[PDB]
Chains A and B, each alone.
Chain A
Amino acid sequence: GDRVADVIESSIGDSVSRALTRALPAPTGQDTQVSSHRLDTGKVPALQAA
């Protein structure tokens, strides 16, 4: 019998594995979409952080 709050609300025993990622079907290579020029500030996909 559980009566104390720290045991009632406890998270001990969670046996399921939290998965951040999922598998998606990929029978062929990915397609390429049409693109055009872009001249704006604040949105930069070239710069990263390794």
Chain B
Amino acid sequence: SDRVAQLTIGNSTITTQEAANIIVGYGEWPSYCSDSDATAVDKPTRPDVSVNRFYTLDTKLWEKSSKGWYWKFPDVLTETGVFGQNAQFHYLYRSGFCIHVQCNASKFHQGALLVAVLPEYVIGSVAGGTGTEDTHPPYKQTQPGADGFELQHPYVLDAGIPISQLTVCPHQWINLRTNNCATIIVPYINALPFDSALNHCNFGLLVVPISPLDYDQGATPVIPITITLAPMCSEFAGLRQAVTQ
């Protein structure tokens, strides 16, 4: 079939019964770095099963007036489990990801979500309203952490770029009439074979409700949204002591 799926990796498993296939980012699977492309000389580590597993980060509430949220990678995991420990202890980093978004409702609820992956998603500021002020986004806005951050101008995605063209990026829709989950597989996206896991963020994940949630009075009003994700083919290098940030 196609509507039913089960994803198993490491010591975790995700089952679903309202799937909509699986999107592979740019038609490419995650992979390790080859010997002709690597530039550092020390032997990298590949912890395998202890880091390649599904992590559930947090839950958000979908309301009739919600605007949207974004998460930054791998900032969400820089402080979770063995993956977070390895990312703190090492200088270099390289991995892909497997994202699963959970959101379920009844057959009498309606609404649509756009789930997209935008690499190098630099967040711009409002520049003081008039535009004569040279401002930069603060820490809680550029690197919100594992708790996410809410969009202020979802029509421009806080960067002056229209949301109507966000579908050129790897994406899936969560339409409550049809499905209740989304899966996007992202390979490693960078111009360098290895990069820092703490200073640099590779991509950002966007969840914006295009069609407002609506239901009749009496039905369940609490509709949560959940994010689950698993690193794939992780490598680390340049071992030293741990650094907090």
Chain A interface (Cβ < 8 Å from any Cβ of B): 37-47
Contacts and interface: CB of A to CB of B under 8 A. Distances in A.
Contacts of B9: 37-39
B47 to A, nearest CB: 15
A42 B5 CA distance: 5
Contact of A45 (B3, B6, B22): B6
Contact of A41 (B8, B10, B19): B19
A39 B7 contact: yes
Contacts of B21: 41
Interface string B211-240: 000000000000000000000000000000
B39 interface: no
A42 B2 contact: yes
B22 A46 contact: no
B52 interface: yes
B98 A39 contact: yes
B217 to A, nearest CB: 34
A47 B185 CA distance: 23
A46 B15 contact: yes
Given A37-B10, A37-B52, A47 B4 contact: yes
A40, A42, A43 — which one has the most chain B CB atoms within 10 A of its CB?
Answer: A42
A41 B19 CA distance: 8
A40 B5 contact: yes
B15 A41 contact: no
B13 interface: yes
Given A39-B98, A41-B2, 20 more contacts: A37-B10, A37-B52, A38-B6, A38-B7, A38-B8, A39-B8, A39-B22, A40-B5, A41-B3, A41-B4, A41-B21, A42-B2, A43-B6, A44-B5, A46-B8, A46-B15, A47-B4, A47-B6, A47-B15, A47-B17
A39 B185 contact: yes
B1 interface: yes
Given A37-B8, A39-B22, A39-B185, A46 B1 contact: no
Contacts of B15: 44, 46-47
Contacts of B2: 41-42
A11 B22 CA distance: 53
B44 to A, nearest CB: 20
